[PDB]
Design a protein around this ligand. Structure first.
Ligand code: HPS
Ligand code: HPS
Length: 106
């Protein structure tokens, strides 16, 4: 189950995810998965980043799930589980701000 998963923060707001991710100690790619505030049935992958122009900041990526069974941020790249999606993005940056590195601390 995903609610067992340490990176699944479940029902928390976008504002709260940003409060948690905007810690000067979080390296780029620090992340968590929460419920989407605006899309029913969807999740949201929240990720920290850092660069010389913007400093420490946060990105949000909607995760769709089909009753057909797939999970995805982009339909071009789907997975059989949310856990497999997290595993994949921890290895490949693709179009994200940075590959997933470490679970956001509480
Ligand atoms: O509104 P949500 O809770 O899905 O969060 C966002 C915000 C911006 C981009 C993707 C998702
Ligand atoms: O340029 P942004 O601040 O949107 O961050 C990135 C960097 C590369 C890909 C996606 C996001």
């Amino acid at each position: 189950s995903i609610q067992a998963e340490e990176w699944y923060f479940g029902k928390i707001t976008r504002r709260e995810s940003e409060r948690l991710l905007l810690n000067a100690e979080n390296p780029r790619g620090t992340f968590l998965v929460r419920e989407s505030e605006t899309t029913k049935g969807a999740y949201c992958l929240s990720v920290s980043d850092f660069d010389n122009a913007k400093g420490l900041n946060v990105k949000h990526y909607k995760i769709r799930k089909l009753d057909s069974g797939g999970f995805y941020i982009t339909s071009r790249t789907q997975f059989n589980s949310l856990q497999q999606l997290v595993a994949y993005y921890s290895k490949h940056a693709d179009g994200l701000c940075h590959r997933l590195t470490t679970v956001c601390p509480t």
